[PDB]
Symmetry: D5
Subunit: 92 residues, 10 copies
């Protein structure tokens, strides 16, 4: 199933824990994309966040994936279920 | 260039049943052509709703505007357009 | 899979009464079936209002979308769909 | 009577850990009790979020208020309460 | 149990003038009964607007729902319902 | 003159807990006096929330302003004021 | 006693031009009377828009409501009312 | 040329008491001057709130900006600006 | 003086396409004059929408108002007006 | 391609005055350059607020993103981006 997911990032104002967090975040998203759950990843133009499409088998699968993100504590997340559009040409 | 585009459809209640049929028909045909040529890259429907949430791939704002204006549904659409940029953490195209 | 769904009903003023009642009976029959079959798990009325707050139990987004699209009221419904996940503190079944 | 209740959790950042685990534990234990007793009927979590969306079954507004006020999390919660009524087309029990 | 209720009235332009009078007269008579019986405890006009702020005293969400649905104005009302609880610092009656 | 007044209270986390309970006292004593004087006419709690929903009865806007401004909680309150008028259908 | 009042005008536009002028005229007639007498203290035009920002000077809420209720435009107005108080730092007239 | 201007004040809680009084005094002094000179035409307080709702009478946007920018309170203000125009039905002379 | 002005167009579905063609031609002619004269300095269309986002450069609020009031489209427009000011970091002319 | 861009500046109260003055100076220098090069076409101040309304002239979403991301003020900005299209009734 497909979900359109928007995330905005707000990291704390305060060390070099920062750069290990960011590398950890980037490493996690690499795996999820490679394995197929994180189908699409874009950056909203002018923003610190992403707009994504996830392809998973349950609400809980998506929930756990998001929860597992290093950034999660600092994320504002919106989840929107997507359905097949009858006029679609090709695959959803 | 990529745009995330949301369209909400509000067709008049007083549409002649036959006219409404052919409006839907030409809309479908128009979006078919745009998908075939690639400008309308992704087309989905928000679960529980009419309309669509889409991703367009065009060369300029003006090209997208013309395309959207060309849709038979345009007079009855509420459209939100949102520019998308490459994400450095992206793996793939 | 569970979804929390809010529906608000706005029937046109100028609806022909026969049909309007024919439409209401149809809505009621369609929802009776979906409840009997288990897809429409919970159905409550938002007090003070003409609509409902529901929990649907289906196996895909598209299954839900088709169900909502099949409602006689659909053209007059304002719908909000919220995906629900398991809460670790939950005792018993979701 | 039934209420749809949404709770959004905003735990203090830069608040000691051992303390934070104790708080979460007492919250978890508190909701278990209430779920066992039946006042906290349904408990879900909105996909992608930290909080819960729930349905409470109590005998009065005051009883609900006291229950919510009793939650270890209460000082860090944003809470929306929405009364639920019987829906004429309901098949089965509310 | 107490409820705070905002009601805002929106009559259509096309409403037949004679039907409008019947609508208003039946509405006033309905509210008179409910105030005399005591379920409709307080009623105030929202100054500058066609609506009211009210406090209802009923035994359940369901009883409130039926009352509100029963109002002739109902098809033209936007209604916000808010459950009220006893306040600790309260002196006197509610 | 009647006003519907909503107050949401947001005490600071850093606030010394004893002052929280002495501020809560001053506040409790003030509302008591105002209710006894008829100016704080009705006082309810919004279910599930830390705040009140009230009806005040005073002779002018400025009078309401001074009363609210005088509350020990004022600096921590989010306040919404709206006027109420007599309703012709009132019984 | 002062109220800041915002008004948005939304006329049907499906009406007789001379009828529109009759409604328009007596609205302006009603507002002339209220400004002369003093209840309608100040009156400005919201720029780019068909509406006004007013300050009313009135001795009760009921007096303000009756005044606004009485306006020829009332059925076609969206109104916001906001009580004003004296500012301790005010040097001149209110 | 008239502007309706709303200002909401949010002084920080960790303010040095002396500084707070200094701040409040200089703000008051600045506003006195602007009112005396006629730029700050009207100055009211929204009832129940800490801020002001004002009408400024200046010659240009730029003038208004620099005036607002120069308020000691500025870094703690939330400000809304709205141009006003002369209303044809205006009896009297703003 | 500069104003950022957004206009959203809501033509009724009631228009004789003769009349619609006419309104459009008229609106276009008026904006031409206003652009040539310099009051309508910039004019863009928001991508995907039937409106315009514009910068006007006029004498006063009263002037902007009259200009907007005068547009053939005015009865069908939703307009937002927002004053702009010289920016300190601006390189060259505003 | 044109973009209408709104930016709101939210400098934290605890911002080291030394850091604040540095940022202000470098932000100003950066906007000067981008205006001189032409990508930052129009810049106005919202009357009575600490921000700006700008029109940017660039070749892609990505170019705009990189520009906005490079602003010294970026970590403290609320930014709204709005694509602009040619208006048929435009004169000159
Ligand atoms: Cl991200
Ligand atoms: Cl569609
Ligand atoms: Cl329903
Ligand atoms: Cl929770
Ligand atoms: Cl009423
Ligand atoms: Cl309280
Ligand atoms: Cl007016
Ligand atoms: Cl002030
Ligand atoms: Cl236009
Ligand atoms: Cl800036």
């Amino acid at each position: 199933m497909l979900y359109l997911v928007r995330m905005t990032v707000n990291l704390p104002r305060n060390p070099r824990e920062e750069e290990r967090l960011k590398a950890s975040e980037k490493a996690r998203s690499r795996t999820l994309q490679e394995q197929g759950q994180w189908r699409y990843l874009w950056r909203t133009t002018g923003k610190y966040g992403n707009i994504s499409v996830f392809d998973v088998n349950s609400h809980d699968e998506l929930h756990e994936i998001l929860w597992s993100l290093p950034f999660f504590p600092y994320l504002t997340i919106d989840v929107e279920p997507l359905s097949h559009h009858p006029a679609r040409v090709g695959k959803d």
